[PDB]
């Protein structure tokens, strides 16, 4: 009750819709605000991306290690590290960790052509049991995030109990599900969202992601010190197609719902 009212206050301060869905592994319990509604998921997409190219390595020894060109014409809006490889090859290793951690969207849009397409990341999740994730579009235009368009959305619920199965669950094999979680563990780009509502001792494997409408996210499998794992989900869109981000409410989000773990 208290934790609801919370959520509720955060939302009106925030100007926005907020979605959240925490599951806490100590007690297989969950808090949900809105977990049912849809979200623009923007570049926390990746994380599906990445577990499916690991889907398919599981029967193909030599795919991480399979190099891909990055040329001019793969170059989209944000490359960060693909900008420094450019007439090179990388890995499928190589852009896996770079769409995790530094979130390149030119990696991202690898992942997807090396698995089949937005239509083939879907089928991955859904052969998963997860119905309500769609990847629509490929980078950069994924990101749009425009109000009661369902391109490129998923639900916290769905998104939290997908994100358990891909890293605490058996949806990859031993080695790569150790792969995913070592991934999200080492993202850098973490710090303003979830992880600054958290204590300082907590260990958290994560991604963010913005996008059009203000659209601020992040998803994370967290370690609270001395406890069982919790998955956390905090979507956040606005109603201004120029709206700024606001990192700062989902790491209010998280504070609201770990206070007490
Ligand atoms: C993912 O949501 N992306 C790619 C990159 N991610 O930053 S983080 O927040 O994921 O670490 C930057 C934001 C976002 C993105 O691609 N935004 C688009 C860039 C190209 N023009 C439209 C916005």
Redesign the pocket.
């Known amino acids: 009750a208290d934790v609801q009212q919370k959520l509720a206050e955060l939302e009106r301060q925030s100007g926005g819709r907020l979605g959240v869905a925490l599951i806490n592994t100590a007690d297989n319990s969950q808090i949900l605000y809105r977990a049912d509604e849809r979200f623009a998921?923007?570049?926390?997409?990746?994380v599906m991306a990445a577990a499916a190219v690991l889907k398919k390595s599981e029967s193909e020894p030599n795919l991480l290690n399979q190099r891909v060109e990055i040329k001019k014409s793969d170059l989209?809006?944000?490359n960060p590290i693909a900008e420094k490889h450019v007439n090179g090859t990388m890995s499928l290793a190589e852009l896996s960790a770079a769409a995790l951690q530094?979130?390149?969207?030119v990696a991202?849009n690898k992942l997807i052509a090396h698995v089949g397409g937005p239509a083939s990341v879907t089928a991955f999740a859904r052969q998963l049991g997860d119905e309500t994730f769609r990847l629509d579009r490929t980078?950069?235009?994924?990101?749009?995030a425009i109000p009661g368009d369902p391109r490129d959305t998923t639900s916290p619920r769905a998104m939290a109990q997908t994100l358990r199965n891909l890293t605490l669950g058996k949806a990859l094999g031993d080695s790569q599900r150790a792969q995913l979680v070592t991934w999200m563990k080492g993202?850098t780009?973490?710090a303003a969202?979830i992880q600054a509502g958290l204590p300082a001792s907590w260990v958290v494997g994560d991604?963010?992601?913005?996008?059009?409408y203000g659209?601020?996210?992040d998803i994370a499998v967290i370690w609270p010190k001395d406890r069982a794992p919790l998955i956390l989900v905090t979507y956040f869109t606005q109603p201004q197609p120029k709206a700024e981000?606001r990192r700062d409410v989902l790491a209010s989000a998280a504070k609201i719902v770990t206070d007490g773990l």
């Open positions: 998921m923007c570049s926390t997409s990746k989209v809006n944000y530094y979130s390149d969207n991202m980078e950069p235009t994924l990101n749009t993202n780009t973490g969202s991604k963010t992601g913005s996008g059009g659209t601020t996210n981000s």
